[PDB]
Amino acid sequence: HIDLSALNPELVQAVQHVVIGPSSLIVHFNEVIGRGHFGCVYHGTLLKIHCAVKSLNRITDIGEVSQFLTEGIIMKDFSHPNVLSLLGICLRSEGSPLVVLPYMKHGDLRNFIRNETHNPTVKDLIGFGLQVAKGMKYLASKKFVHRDLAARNCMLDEKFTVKVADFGLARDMYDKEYYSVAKLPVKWMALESLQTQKFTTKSDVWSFGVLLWELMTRGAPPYPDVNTFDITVYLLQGRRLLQPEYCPDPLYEVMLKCWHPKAEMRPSFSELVSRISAIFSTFIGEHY
Ligand SMILES: CN1CCN(c2cnc3cc(C(F)(F)F)cc(-c4cccc(O)c4)c3n2)CC1
Fold this sequence. Notes:
The PDB classes it as transferase. By secondary structure, the chain is of the alpha+beta class.
C-alpha cells in the first residue's frame, strides 16, 4: 500500500502526461503473459487498445514511487518505430505500480525465429537485424547504453516490426538461464565488459553482432560449449562465432567487425544501418 497522498503535488503535475487513470485501464490478472524478477506481465485493455501491463513488485517506498514517476516522464519521450514505447504508468492505492506497454503479438524475437509455425526468409531475418540496428542507432543518439542486447530482449509486433525492449521501466531478468553470477549475459558481452564489467555503446555493438548471429542461425545458442570462465581466453585468442549457414558473406563480415577486440574500431550503429541496409537491399522480397 503506497501512500499516494504523500507524493509532492508539483511532481504529480509534471508527470501527468505519463499517467493513466485507474478508470482507463482493465488489467486481466487472470491472463498472465509472462514474468521477470521485478514483476509479472498481464494482458490489459487501455481506453480499446490491447496492452501489456507490468506490475513492478519491488517498488514499496514513497521515495521509490517518486523516482519511478520521474523515470516514466523521461522514458515516455523516447520515440522510434524500432524501440518499445511506454504507453504510461498507473498508480494504485493497493498493489504495486503498473507499467503500461504495447502488446507484442509475436513475443520475443528469439522465440519467434525458433517457432516452427513461422518461416521467415533470409531477407526477413536480415530485415529484423536492420530494424534492431535502427532502434539502437536511436538509443545511442540519446546516449542510452542498453547493456543487455540479445534476441530475447527484442519484441515483435503484429506487423513484424521489431522493437528493442528490456530497458527503462521494462528492464528485467526475464530468463535467468542466460546470465552468470550481479547476473551477467556472458555469451553476449564484449571482451572488455568481461574484463571490467563496464558497458558502453561500443559494447552494445558487440552484443548486436551476437544478436545478428542469433538471427541468421534462427536462434542457435552462442558458444554453448565454452564455459563462462573460459570465454575471455577464447575471445583473447581471436576466436569467434562461425558464419551461419544462410548468412551472406558481407553480413558475416559485419558481425566480425562488431567483435573487434578494440572497441574503438567497431562500427557505429549508424554505419551498421548503412551496411546492413545495403545488404538487405540486394534481396528481393514479395512486393519489393
Ligand atoms: C504467447 N505469447 C503471446 C505474446 N507474448 C507477449 C506479448 N507482448 C509482450 C509485451 C511485453 C512488454 F514488454 F511490452 F511488456 C512483454 C512481453 C513478455 C513479458 C515477459 C516475458 C515474455 O516472454 C514476454 C510480451 N509477451 C508472449 C507470449
